[PDB]
């Protein structure tokens, strides 16, 4: 026996465990970039836009986060967004984006 994982393989069959299921769906949304998927190249995370901006240009950061959230929402209307948080780290080299659909508080370490 060997178990499985959720990253582009399977979390659960369908949405039984609702919130973790939506978090999984968003996970395979965010783990893909532009030009790496047939049919909808714009589908997936838009890091190619919001990679390496200066960490202190709060206007550009808020603009990019707003646009990304709105496009991912219109992309997947099934899962609306509750909480998005942007938290710097110990050094200038670490940022964290924390997305929670009211409970999931799943976070990823980004760099700008």
């Amino acid at each position: 026996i060997d178990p499985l994982l959720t990253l582009e393989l399977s979390g659960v069959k369908t949405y039984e465990s609702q919130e973790e299921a939506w978090g999984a769906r968003l996970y395979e949304w965010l783990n893909t970039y532009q030009g790496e998927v047939y049919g909808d190249p714009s589908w997936g995370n838009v890091l190619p836009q919001f990679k390496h901006e200066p960490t202190n240009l709060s206007h550009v950061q808020i603009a990019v986060e707003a646009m990304l959230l709105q496009k991912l929402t219109v992309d997947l209307p099934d899962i609306p967004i509750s909480g998005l948080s942007v938290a710097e780290g110990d050094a200038f080299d670490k940022l964290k984006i924390s997305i929670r659909i009211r409970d999931i508080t799943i976070t990823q370490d980004v760099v700008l």
Partner: protein, 158 residues
């Protein structure tokens, strides 16, 4: 990264980022101050409750040409009138739209789709040596793109 922005867009103003109003679209960004007189309203229609109405917003914003009027006032009002003005003859009849912008408030409350239905202001404020305005108070009237549900609305704040 982001397209061109106008108003107090940079941190050089030395003002609290929370109190800044921001509008953003695919090609334009305008940043300003949350001025007094703001209001919003949501309601419904009945006669037996029939249905609802989309959200409505009335936002007066004050703009100051502290250092660069060209980018802070003239460019700002130009972008605003471009956004409100329906561009329905841009040689692209296959998709022309009056265009909608996304609104950020307090850096935490976001309206993904809102329509700038009305704009007004006064041009009688004093100017500079070149002649760009020093101050203005532009009032804006905004509408939601649809009659949003409770599940749509309540879960959108921070």
């Amino acid at each position: 990264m982001a397209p061109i922005a106008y108003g107090v867009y940079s941190q050089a103003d030395g003002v609290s980022p929370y109190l800044k109003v921001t509008l953003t679209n695919s090609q334009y960004q305008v940043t300003g101050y949350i001025s007094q007189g703001a209001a919003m309203n949501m309601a419904q229609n009945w006669e037996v409750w029939e249905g609802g109405t989309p959200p409505t917003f009335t936002l007066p914003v004050t703009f100051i040409a502290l250092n660069n009027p060209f980018i802070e006032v003239s460019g700002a009002i130009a972008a605003l009138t471009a956004m409100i003005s329906p561009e329905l003859k841009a040689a692209n009849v296959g998709g022309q739209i009056p265009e909608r912008v996304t609104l950020n408030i307090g850096r935490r409350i976001n309206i993904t789709d809102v329509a700038i239905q009305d704009l007004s202001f006064d041009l009688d404020a004093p100017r500079d040596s070149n002649g760009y305005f020093l101050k203005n108070t532009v009032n804006l009237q905004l509408t939601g793109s649809s009659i949003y549900n409770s599940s749509d609305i309540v879960r959108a704040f921070q």
